[PDB]
């Protein structure tokens, strides 16, 4: 189907200062941070938008920290609590009254194995849309 207008080209989640003291036990995680992706002006014939997610994983499957803090994974979840690791998709129905589509997502840092170390956190998740 024809494409909508992508109205969120770039978004940034700043997790702030996390503490290794509280990222010691396996499975410890930061609070969730909200991020939304907006599509507008969906053309006639387009009833669904599918987002596809990419970026480098680490051994845990979650997105690799490209910064210096060790044992830090980055996790993206959808509105159903599903993890959107690299290669995942999420499909939303267009609201015909506004010809728009909204993707409410959340992000957190996670330590799968525990024992996070001090350092930076940096990652980028890319999103590419198909239309049907």
């Amino acid at each position: 189907a024809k494409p909508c207008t992508v109205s969120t080209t770039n978004a940034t989640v700043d997790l702030g200062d996390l503490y290794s003291f509280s990222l010691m036990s396996a499975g410890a995680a930061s609070a969730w941070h909200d991020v939304a992706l907006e599509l507008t002006n969906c053309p006639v014939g387009t009833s669904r938008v599918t987002a596809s997610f990419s970026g480098a994983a680490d051994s845990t499957g979650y997105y690799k920290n490209q910064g210096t803090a060790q044992n830090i994974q980055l996790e993206l979840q959808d509105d159903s609590g599903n993890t959107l690791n690299t290669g995942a998709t999420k499909t939303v129905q267009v609201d015909d009254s506004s010809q728009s589509a909204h993707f409410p997502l959340q992000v957190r840092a996670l330590t799968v194995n525990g024992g996070a170390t001090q350092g930076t956190i940096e990652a980028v998740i890319s999103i590419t849309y198909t239309y049907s």
Binding site: A11, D14, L15, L18, S126, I127, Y129
Partner: peptide, 10 residues
């Protein structure tokens, strides 16, 4: 679209 994630572990 791109989602950039930043932070520090202290």
């Amino acid at each position: 679209s791109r989602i950039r994630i930043r932070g520090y572990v202290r």
